[PDB]
Amino acid sequence: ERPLPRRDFQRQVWLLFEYPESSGPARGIAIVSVLVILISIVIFCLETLPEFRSSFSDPFFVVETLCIIWFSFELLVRFFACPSKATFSRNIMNLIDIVAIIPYFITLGTELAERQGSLAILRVIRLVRVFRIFKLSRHSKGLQILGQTLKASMRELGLLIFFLFIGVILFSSAVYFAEADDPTSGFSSIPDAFWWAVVTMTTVGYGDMHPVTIGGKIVGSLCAIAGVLTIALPVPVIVSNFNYFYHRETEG
C-alpha cells in the first residue's frame, strides 16, 4: 500500500492526520477540519451583503485569521511527517492548500506596505478565494470520483464545446440576416445574437420576444431542434465513465 515513516514519533502523527480511520482522535480531527472549512465558506459568502459593505472591530476579520491559522498549521504538520517529498509536491491536494493561504497573506502584505505609506488586482485576489470549497475533496469520495471522471473524458468535453461553437456562429448569423430589414429588431449585429443562440440551444430560454419576423421564427425552431442533438451526442460517454469509476470502488 502506502509506505510509513518507520519512526518512533512519526508513524503516530502520520496515522493521526492522514488516516482518519485508525483512532478516535483521528476522527475528531477530521470533524474539526470539516467544521472549519464550512465556517470559512459561510464567512466568505456573508462578507459581501450590503449591510456590511485591521483587528478588534470587524469581528469577521477575527474569524478569517483563525481559519488561516488552522489551515497553515495542518499543512505544516502534514508536510513534515511524510516519507517522500517529490510525491508531496506532485500531489494535488497540496497545491490547493497553498492556494488558500495566499490571499490572506498577500492582503496583509499590502496593508503593511500602505501602513508605512489597483482595484483590479484586489478584485482578482478576492475572486481566487473561492477555491477553499475544493478542500472538501479530501473528505468526500464523490468529489474524487468526479475529478477522475473529468480527467478521463477531456476529448468529449472538447467535442461538446467545438460543436456548440459551430452551432452558435451558424444560427446567430442566420437570425441576424433574416431579421435585419425591420427597425424593431433587438439584433443589431451578429455578436449581439450570440447570447440568444446559446440560451435556446441549451433550452434555458431567453425570455424576451426577440425574433419578430417569420424567418426569425423558422430559424428559432431549427435552433431549438438542433441544440438537442449536438448536446446529447457526447454525454453517454461521460455518464459511462462516471458509472465505471463509481462502482469500481464499492464493488471491486
Q: Which residues bind a copy of itself (CB under 8 A)?
A: 41, 45-46, 48-50, 53, 123, 126-127, 130, 133, 136, 140, 142-143, 146, 149, 159-164, 166, 169-170, 173-174, 176-177, 180, 188-191, 194-195, 198-200, 202-209, 217, 220-221, 224-225, 228-229, 231-233, 235-239, 242-243
Contact map string, positions 125 to 164, toward K ion, x by CB under 5 A? ----------------------------------------
HEC string for 105-159: HHHHHHHHHHHHCCHHHHHHHHHHHHHHHHHHHHCCHHHHHHHHHHHCCHHHHHH
Among positions 207, 208, 250, 251, the unique one binding K ion when judged by CB under 5 A:
207
Q: Which three cell numbers stand for residue 190?
A: 451578429
What distances in angstroms separate CA 143 from CA 92, 137, 147, 170, 250, one per listed residue?
13, 5, 6, 37, 15
Eight-class DSSP state of 129: G
State in angstroms the smallest separation of the CB of 81 from a copy of itself.
30
Q: Which is nearer to K ion, 86 or 204 (CB)?
A: 204
Q: Are the C-beta atoms of 169 and 151 separated by less than 8 Å?
A: no
Q: Which three cell numbers stand for residue 87?
A: 510525491
State in angstroms the smallest separation of the CB of 58 from a copy of itself.
17
Binding partner selected for residue 87 from a copy of itself, K ion, none, CB under the kind-specific 5 to 8 Å limit? none
Binding site for K ion (CB under 5 A): 203, 205, 207
